[PDB]
Amino acid sequence: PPSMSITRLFPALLECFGIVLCGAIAGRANVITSTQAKGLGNFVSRFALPALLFKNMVVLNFSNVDWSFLYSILIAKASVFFIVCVLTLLVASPDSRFSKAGLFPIFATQSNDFALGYPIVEALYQTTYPEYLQYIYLVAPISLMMLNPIGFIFCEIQKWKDTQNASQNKIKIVGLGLLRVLQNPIVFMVFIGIAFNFILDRKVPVYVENFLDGLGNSFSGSALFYLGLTMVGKIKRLKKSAFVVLILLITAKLLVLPLLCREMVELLDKGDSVVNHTSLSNYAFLYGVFPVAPGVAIFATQFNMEVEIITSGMVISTFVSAPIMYVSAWLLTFPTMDPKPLAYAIQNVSFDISIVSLISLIWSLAILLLSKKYKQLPHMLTTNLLIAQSIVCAGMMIWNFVKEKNFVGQILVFVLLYSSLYSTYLWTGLLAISLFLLKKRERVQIPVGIIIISGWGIPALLVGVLLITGKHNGDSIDSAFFYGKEQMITTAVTLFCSILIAGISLMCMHCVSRCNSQSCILAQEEEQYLQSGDQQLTRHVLLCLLLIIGLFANLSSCLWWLFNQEPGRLYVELQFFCAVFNFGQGFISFGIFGLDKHLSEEIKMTCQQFIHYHRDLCIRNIVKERRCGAKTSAGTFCGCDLVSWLIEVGLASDRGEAVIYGDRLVQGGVIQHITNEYEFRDEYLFYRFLQ
Amino acid sequence: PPSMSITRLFPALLECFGIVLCGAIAGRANVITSTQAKGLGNFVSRFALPALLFKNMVVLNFSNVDWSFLYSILIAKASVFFIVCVLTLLVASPDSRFSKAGLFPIFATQSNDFALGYPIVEALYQTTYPEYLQYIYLVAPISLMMLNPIGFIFCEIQKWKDTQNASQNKIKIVGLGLLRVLQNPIVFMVFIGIAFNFILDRKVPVYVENFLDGLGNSFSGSALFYLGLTMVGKIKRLKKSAFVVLILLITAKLLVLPLLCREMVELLDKGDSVVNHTSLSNYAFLYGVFPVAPGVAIFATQFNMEVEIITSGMVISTFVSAPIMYVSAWLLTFPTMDPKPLAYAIQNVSFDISIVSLISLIWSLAILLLSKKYKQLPHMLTTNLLIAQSIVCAGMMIWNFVKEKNFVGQILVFVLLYSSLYSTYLWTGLLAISLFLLKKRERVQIPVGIIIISGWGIPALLVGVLLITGKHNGDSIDSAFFYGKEQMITTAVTLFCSILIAGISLMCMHCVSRCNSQSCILAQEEEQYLQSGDQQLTRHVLLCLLLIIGLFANLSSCLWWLFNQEPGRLYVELQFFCAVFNFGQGFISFGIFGLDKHLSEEIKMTCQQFIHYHRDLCIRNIVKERRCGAKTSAGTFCGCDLVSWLIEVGLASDRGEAVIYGDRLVQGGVIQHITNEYEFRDEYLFYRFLQ
Numbered sequence A, B: 001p002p003s004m005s006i007t008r009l010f011p012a013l014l015e016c017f018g019i020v021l022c023g024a025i026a027g028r029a030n031v032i033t034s035t036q037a038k039g040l041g042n043f044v045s046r047f048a049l050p051a052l053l054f055k056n057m058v059v060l061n062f063s064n065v066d067w068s069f070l071y072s073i074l075i076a077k078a079s080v081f082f083i084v085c086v087l088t089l090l091v092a093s094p095d096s097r098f099s100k101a102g103l104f105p106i107f108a109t110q111s112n113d114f115a116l117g118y119p120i121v122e123a124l125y126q127t128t129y130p131e132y133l134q135y136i137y138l139v140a141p142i143s144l145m146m147l148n149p150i151g152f153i154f155c156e157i158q159k160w161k162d163t164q165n166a167s168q169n170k171i172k173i174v175g176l177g178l179l180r181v182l183q184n185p186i187v188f189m190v191f192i193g194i195a196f197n198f199i200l201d202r203k204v205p206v207y208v209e210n211f212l213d214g215l216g217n218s219f220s221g222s223a224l225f226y227l228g229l230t231m232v233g234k235i236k237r238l239k240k241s242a243f244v245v246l247i248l249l250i251t252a253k254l255l256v257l258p259l260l261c262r263e264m265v266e267l268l269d270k271g272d273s274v275v276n277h278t279s280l281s282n283y284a285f286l287y288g289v290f291p292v293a294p295g296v297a298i299f300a301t302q303f304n305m306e307v308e309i310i311t312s313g314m315v316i317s318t319f320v321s322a323p324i325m326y327v328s329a330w331l332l333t334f335p336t337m338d339p340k341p342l343a344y345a346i347q348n349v350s351f352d353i354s355i356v357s358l359i360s361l362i363w364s365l366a367i368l369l370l371s372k373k374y375k376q377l378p379h380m381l382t383t384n385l386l387i388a389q390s391i392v393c394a395g396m397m398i399w400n401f402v403k404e405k406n407f408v409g410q411i412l413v414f415v416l417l418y419s420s421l422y423s424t425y426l427w428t429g430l431l432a433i434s435l436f437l438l439k440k441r442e443r444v445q446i447p448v449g450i451i452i453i454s455g456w457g458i459p460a461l462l463v464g465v466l467l468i469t470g471k472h473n474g475d476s477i478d479s480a481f482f483y484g485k486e487q488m489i490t491t492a493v494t495l496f497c498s499i500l501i502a503g504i505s506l507m508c509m510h511c512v513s514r515c516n517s518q519s520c521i522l523a524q525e526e527e528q529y530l531q532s533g534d535q536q537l538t539r540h541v542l543l544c545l546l547l548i549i550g551l552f553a554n555l556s557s558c559l560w561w562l563f564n565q566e567p568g569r570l571y572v573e574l575q576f577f578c579a580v581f582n583f584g585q586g587f588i589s590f591g592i593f594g595l596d597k598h599l600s601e602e603i604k605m606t607c608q609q610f611i612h613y614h615r616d617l618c619i620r621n622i623v624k625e626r627r628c629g630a631k632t633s634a635g636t637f638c639g640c641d642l643v644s645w646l647i648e649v650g651l652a653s654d655r656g657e658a659v660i661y662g663d664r665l666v667q668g669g670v671i672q673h674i675t676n677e678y679e680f681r682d683e684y685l686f687y688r689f690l691q
């Protein structure tokens, strides 16, 4: 049997990043705001997590633990900590160097294994190597006890430099460091659990066993939901220096650390069984690809140093953990099967990725069609590329259900699948061209019909001339070799030209109430400004670049197969990655465009408060409209302006509270659009104030 | 084997009301306010509970269900609904008769089965009758869809009465009621679950299985915590008419409904097996002793009708529901064992209620001792009573570990146990006497000395005269008949006298920084205010009556044994109840006194908000200090006044965030005590405002 239950990995990830996704769409849709997520955070970080730790360490048997694994992971984490710390000490701004050295190693060493790592390890190693579930509750607290103190010492040194007074105490900063380390629920709950394990004999009392199980089982889902709740509105556009340091930190989290852990395990472990040693090394690798634990974000926000870099890094690393961990575990278990089960495995992962991406794509197309935003040219081409992605994702499903079974319709399904995939590649090219045209000249008369017929016909011509030449080889399971070298040649030439088209573009990249059209010209100006938006050129650029990433990966795959024509144990990674991306592009498209915020007594009391102690305040200054030609309401305020004023005054805690309060004010007959065209939102629109 | 695993009942309750307790002490200690509890409530009521329903019905097999059980429970609920509704229709205020008829029946028919009933049924009927776990998810949504429509129709009728118009049509009212019930997640989620059960073949897809398990396992742990969070402050002192209607409603929830369900089940069940029918009737009884689901509270707060009666009724019903479930499940299976295993069972439940009470009682005693409040007179007397209550629990614990084992020390352990128990009875008597004396002029100091010597020596004299007369019958397991009939008489005489004493008592019911030493009087008055209270004679009275309830129960038990001397299958209920109360009084004392509220950039930003837009509004309004003899600070405001002003203005939504804002603003060096003796709390203390 395989060292791990690989077939159970994808649902578990689908659970984890499923629950997180729920939380995100709960936070963005104002179902659970930022203030209201504090209660969930306190519950999961004060009651659920300490009960899980206590229950899972009291029963733990300290006499049957492979300490070599813990030593190896601790050595690897310490090495990454030291390397990052010394590198920051050498090259960084001298003003905040200590800060950049007191948080960056913590970002690159800790892991989100309690909430986002434990479900995956449980799914992988529960019916094969259950003892692997103990190390999650040992490595994380120990590494939190032997690395966090050094980082916090550095942060307290930076705070000392913030004051730079006559205080020269060297023990005070260290004491505060270990005090802030010891004031963490994880550390002292670990200590209490160990003490009670020593007191008892690994027999949790029956009186408290049910309480502990009930309060600990409700951690994983709740913790993931809270993580999703805090993971909305954090990531922001960064300076190029911030971009490159984020790249380096994320790479040091999911590239340096896993390799270091696997090397140390294959260096220290003395296990007689080769299979056990290989599985242990695989576990060491898969333990380091875990995302950055959100504890680094709260540490940064407590010290108030690099809050944006640390929070955005944790947010991005949470995304990047999923595909990396999936491909890592699959590639790690790949050299354990014959090439024929290898082909079945790659087909099955393609089918799973295809079903889930198809659901996401159908959803995103639902937003596109019911939002009527596809009329604009960029969104028209995005919808066209998205329906092409839906066609390829469904064609893969039908192909796996018809591979080598019905040769009669195999020609038809192959034609549909690869015509749609070539359409996706060429449509990435056409998207690049469309943003090129938008940047070059505005208000052009070029039809979209020519672009559409090209993007759906050149793939059709390619597949037709591919079918005409050669013969059908209805024996290979994979679709890429249904025809042979000819098919790979066509798939390489169209893929090549697609990336040249993409790269060429990329490189160069009075009144009181409602007023009449003359007296409400500012509303028309705001409507024109809004029409100037709703394009999201940066969003399209991001989609195109992330698509070009997989386009280049598949180009490298086809060139390697054509020229070398030798597997060499490296080509398996290439085929797996190309099969992953070809039908996982739906996830990317859903992530960028499939999700967006665009698409009585209590309210009376709130309106009374606002009109009692806040109507006549400095908001009167912030509410004003300039003369719209000859006449104006002179009582119109921007939604963002009122939100900012409410935040600064203190009636709201974040933007969500401000927008909900404004929604209540609107429902209370006080706030309304100057022309009633729209409804309260945190965007630049003038709103009249009535009375 | 027994029809239910009764030995696992106590831990499960201890889990459930344990988790709730955590939530309460989380809410009371301001760890999670109500606004922050809104997020947890939304999570549990929108993502966890719907996932649990969907997962538990997609796999549900409608082909094999005992429909007679559901028919019986629905008939019983409908009968209770009809009886209560017609009763409040006949006798109630005509102005709000419809309100009292549309909320009371849904208060006395629904149950907290999803969160507070499922764990108990799982603990009782998982390894014996697992099919009993389906009916929790079947009866509750059905009763929601067949009873709450009528209730909501009545509430909409009351709303029509509130705003009378010439629209006799009932179509709008019934439509609004059906829309209100249909907007509940518990309704359309079970509809979708049934639809997907029909679509599939009770095989939830592996892609969503892990997601559903992860998002549904975090409901039982989290719903109880949210219930505890929302249980803080919802109980309010009620008028005597409200008291009697609450008595009637709680009785109709845990006396009428379970009896009706059991009768209807033993009316419609055609089960051939007598054991299965008896177990089903026991399940029907144990399903109606469940507490009122908090959905009735949110319905009442949505309609804004009897919010105080419904909320307080749910709060009280949940607490009453625990001992009633314990005694009901024990008594129901009580005649399933021989009298000697009967004695072992009552001893074991005594040992369980003994250990838990000792843990909470040591906690309460520690609170009293480190509070230094035992120097007070009522508090000294109740501290002595509490020490006796701890000694009796410890003696019972030792007795169970020494019963019929070491006859040498059995005399000593028995003497300790029953001397402590007689001390508790006589100390309830002396507490009644002390509160009667406190109700008087109280110019005479209470004789602490002779009262304590009496309360701790008269039990010693009683146990000595009991030991002197008679012989040692060291064969009976129960401690009430270790000696014989003489012990019964000795217990009955002191118990009688204690209630006579208690019944008699019951029926007897300038400057800016610092004020000058010679120019400061009102600060001395507000200091006197504190020790004018801090006696909580109402709390002591409530504890006294709660104790006399069990004293009367035990008196009835001993009188029945003395006079009738016949078991009759009813005296077993008496011995179980007396053994439950003898060592359960620690729970009452802990609930009464063991828990109470008595025992930098963000703060700068809040202080900036205050020093930008809030002092001009409040200083001119909320601060006013009379001349302290000759001079005063003229800037002292009561904490309650400031909290009320903050609530009304809108800086806080309730008292919790109001006092949190006050604590922050104190830490900002603006608000402080007039003489700096005390911190910021929501009481009647004067606070200066500095600059």
Ligand SMILES: CCCCCCCCCCCCCCCCCC(=O)OC[C@H](COP(=O)(O)OC[C@H](N)C(=O)O)OC(=O)CCCCCCCCCCCCCCCCC
Binding pocket: A045, A046, A047, A050, A051, A054, A183, A184, A185, A205, A207, A208, A211, B014, B015, B017, B018, B019, B021, B022, B025, B026, B029, B031
């Ligand atoms: C049979 C069971 C009956 C249950 C009945 C109720 C029992 C409740 C026990 C716990 C209640 C605790 C409520 C305290 C309210 C405040 C919570 C609290 O202190 O914060 C949560 C803390 C950690 O916080 P932090 O992040 O370090 O905060 C800084 C802090 N302010 C400071 O001091 O800077 O962390 C904690 O306080 C964690 C508390 C949660 C406890 C969960 C795990 C332990 C369960 C209890 C163990 C029983 C098993 C014992 C075995 C046998 C023993 C005889």
Ligand SMILES: CCCCCCCCCCCCCCCCCC(=O)OC[C@H](COP(=O)(O)OC[C@H](N)C(=O)O)OC(=O)CCCCCCCCCCCCCCCCC
Binding pocket: A192, B017, B018, B021, B025, B028, B029, B030, B031, B356, B359, B360, B363, B599
């Ligand atoms: C060595 C441990 C072995 C035992 C095993 C269990 C392990 C427990 C986990 C370890 C933590 C122990 C918790 C004890 C309390 C420590 C207090 C603490 O850590 O401070 C944190 C808390 C609250 O946070 P805050 O922001 O400081 O709040 C203060 C104030 N309220 C404010 O507004 O800023 O500060 C407070 O203010 C807290 C006061 C609340 C106290 C209420 C406790 C009730 C316990 C009742 C349980 C008794 C047993 C019950 C039996 C069964 C009953 C159903």
Ligand SMILES: CCCCCCCCCCCCCCCCCC(=O)OC[C@H](COP(=O)(O)OC[C@H](N)C(=O)O)OC(=O)CCCCCCCCCCCCCCCCC
Binding pocket: A014, A015, A017, A018, A019, A021, A022, A025, A026, A029, A031, B046, B047, B050, B051, B054, B183, B184, B185, B205, B207, B208, B211
């Ligand atoms: C492996 C799967 C990966 C999945 C990835 C993520 C997918 C997420 C799907 C669900 C998340 C939806 C987020 C919605 C955000 C808004 C919340 C929302 O609508 O309010 C909560 C609602 C119901 O509340 P209400 O009391 O009626 O509120 C009144 C409401 N405003 C109204 O319309 O008046 O209640 C809800 O919104 C309930 C939604 C929670 C869903 C949990 C149970 C269903 C899980 C999904 C089922 C899939 C199984 C299908 C099997 C295979 C089928 C092909």
Ligand SMILES: CCCCCCCCCCCCCCCCCC(=O)OC[C@H](COP(=O)([O-])OCC[N+](C)(C)C)OC(=O)CCCCCCCCCCCCCCCCC
Binding pocket: A348, A351, A352, A355, A356, A359, A363, B199, B205, B206, B207, B208
């Ligand atoms: C928010 C509003 C949602 C409205 C949605 C529209 C109505 C509901 C959908 C239409 C009715 C149901 C159609 C499918 C039922 C029949 C097909 C079926 O189940 O076959 C089983 C088959 C079983 O597959 P199989 O039989 O091929 O299994 C073999 C698998 N291998 C090969 C790997 C061994 O497929 C499924 O399991 C169905 C797809 C499940 C996808 C689960 C993950 C997707 C993530 C999103 C889930 C839903 C989120 C909710 C919001 C999104 C909108 C949906």
Ligand SMILES: CCCCCCCCCCCCCCCCCC(=O)OC[C@H](COP(=O)([O-])OCC[N+](C)(C)C)OC(=O)CCCCCCCCCCCCCCCCC
Binding pocket: A199, A205, A206, A207, A208, B348, B351, B352, B355, B356, B359, B360, B363
């Ligand atoms: C919040 C701060 C709390 C600090 C507490 C003070 C420090 C911790 C306690 C002192 C050290 C440990 C002493 C006990 C260890 C040895 C005895 C032992 O447990 O033996 C097992 C024995 C086992 O009993 P047994 O072996 O007789 O079991 C047989 C049972 N029958 C007969 C029914 C079959 O006793 C216990 O289980 C002890 C009670 C455990 C808890 C039970 C529920 C109590 C409710 C509260 C739980 C705790 C909440 C946390 C806060 C409250 C304060 C505690």
Ligand SMILES: CCCCCCCCCCCCCCCCCC(=O)OC[C@H](COP(=O)(O)OCCN)OC(=O)CCCCCCCCCCCCCCCCC
Binding pocket: A083, A084, A087, A088, A091, A092, A093, A100, A241, A244, A245, A247, A248, A249, A251, A252, A256
């Ligand atoms: C990724 C794929 C492959 C790419 C290959 C090519 C990329 C380069 C590879 C080597 C990089 C080593 C580090 C070199 C850093 C170069 C400087 C830099 O990126 O910017 C430093 C940044 C400048 O900021 P500045 O614009 O001055 O800001 C002013 C306003 N505050 O100032 C800072 O913010 C300073 C903080 C920098 C912290 C760097 C930590 C790096 C840790 C991981 C590196 C690898 C470690 C392991 C190596 C292998 C094992 C031995």
Ligand SMILES: CCCCCCCCCCCCCCCCCC(=O)OC[C@H](COP(=O)(O)OCCN)OC(=O)CCCCCCCCCCCCCCCCC
Binding pocket: A235, A236, A237, A238, A243, A246, A247, A250, A251, A254, A255, A316, A320, A323, A324, A538, A539, A540, A542, A546, A549, A552, A553, A556
């Ligand atoms: C060379 C060795 C390869 C080893 C492979 C495995 C290890 C890879 C290690 C991770 C590499 C670092 C990735 C970190 C990307 C950081 C990007 C970033 O900071 O950009 C933020 C951006 C969001 O931008 P924002 O402005 O918020 O969006 C506005 C919306 N219109 O958001 C983004 O731009 C998100 C970018 C991340 C998207 C996923 C990238 C995954 C990378 C690995 C995939 C698998 C391996 C690919 C190998 C290709 C081979 C040809």
Ligand SMILES: CCCCCCCCCCCCCCCCCC(=O)OC[C@H](COP(=O)(O)OCCN)OC(=O)CCCCCCCCCCCCCCCCC
Binding pocket: B235, B236, B237, B238, B243, B246, B247, B250, B251, B254, B255, B316, B320, B323, B324, B327, B538, B539, B542, B546, B549
């Ligand atoms: C087996 C037969 C019984 C079956 C189930 C019960 C049905 C019949 C009894 C129904 C009614 C029981 C509860 C009555 C609650 C009435 C409300 C009440 O007492 O609340 C007021 C009290 C104090 O409120 P507070 O605001 O603090 O007042 C300040 C004083 N100035 O607030 C409180 O302290 C809350 C109320 C405490 C309730 C104590 C326990 C219940 C009363 C005993 C009778 C029912 C249980 C019998 C068996 C117990 C053991 C199994």
Ligand SMILES: CCCCCCCCCCCCCCCCCC(=O)OC[C@H](COP(=O)(O)OCCN)OC(=O)CCCCCCCCCCCCCCCCC
Binding pocket: B083, B084, B087, B088, B091, B092, B093, B100, B241, B244, B245, B247, B248, B249, B251, B252, B256
């Ligand atoms: C419990 C232990 C034993 C107790 C023995 C003594 C009582 C025996 C039972 C008596 C029942 C009488 C029911 C009618 C209520 C009597 C009057 C009352 O308590 O107050 C009704 C209250 C009026 O309040 P008022 O003082 O006027 O308020 C002033 C400000 N508006 O107005 C209201 O708020 C009306 C609310 C009526 C709700 C009645 C619910 C009854 C449900 C259970 C009854 C039995 C049902 C099952 C019986 C067996 C099956 C048929």
Ligand SMILES: CC(C)CCC[C@@H](C)[C@H]1CC[C@H]2[C@@H]3CC=C4C[C@@H](OC(=O)CCC(=O)O)CC[C@]4(C)[C@H]3CC[C@]12C
Binding pocket: A013, A014, A017, A018, A020, A021, A024, A028, A231, A232, A233, A234, A235, A319, A322, A323, A326, A584, A587, A590, A591, A595
């Ligand atoms: C193996 C790989 C190819 C797929 C398996 C993991 C998926 C289930 C993951 C990968 C990418 C994830 C998505 C990446 C990006 C986001 C945006 C994220 O929200 C934000 O970061 C934006 C919040 C805001 O609007 O401020 C919410 C989750 C979501 C949809 C993720 C949902 C889960 C996804 C699809």
Ligand SMILES: CC(C)CCC[C@@H](C)[C@H]1CC[C@H]2[C@@H]3CC=C4C[C@@H](OC(=O)CCC(=O)O)CC[C@]4(C)[C@H]3CC[C@]12C
Binding pocket: A233, A234, A235, A236, A319, A320, A323, A542, A546, A581, A584, A585, A587, A588, A589, A590, A591, A592
């Ligand atoms: C193997 C393939 C399938 C890659 C798997 C990962 C992607 C599906 C993820 C990883 C990074 C994600 C992106 C990271 C950042 C953002 C920005 C985010 O928008 C913001 O600027 C956040 C704030 C806001 O939306 O208000 C929207 C999601 C998006 C495009 C994410 C879309 C989904 C991405 C590409």
Ligand SMILES: CC(C)CCC[C@@H](C)[C@H]1CC[C@H]2[C@@H]3CC=C4C[C@@H](OC(=O)CCC(=O)O)CC[C@]4(C)[C@H]3CC[C@]12C
Binding pocket: B013, B014, B017, B018, B020, B021, B024, B028, B231, B232, B233, B234, B235, B315, B319, B322, B323, B324, B326, B353, B584, B587, B590, B591, B595
């Ligand atoms: C069957 C018997 C032996 C035990 C039944 C279960 C116990 C574990 C229950 C019985 C009474 C319960 C207590 C009754 C009263 C309260 C007060 C309650 O808080 C409030 O209602 C007031 C909150 C506020 O001050 O605002 C918090 C739970 C608690 C301690 C309860 C915790 C759980 C207890 C001890």
Ligand SMILES: CC(C)CCC[C@@H](C)[C@H]1CC[C@H]2[C@@H]3CC=C4C[C@@H](OC(=O)CCC(=O)O)CC[C@]4(C)[C@H]3CC[C@]12C
Binding pocket: B232, B233, B234, B235, B316, B319, B320, B323, B542, B546, B580, B581, B584, B585, B587, B588, B591, B592
């Ligand atoms: C089988 C034996 C152990 C009896 C089990 C029942 C008692 C232990 C429970 C049942 C109801 C409980 C009461 C329910 C509600 C309250 C009000 C609660 O708070 C108040 O006094 C109201 C104001 C507030 O604190 O919010 C204090 C605990 C108390 C008296 C509880 C004390 C413990 C009681 C009596």
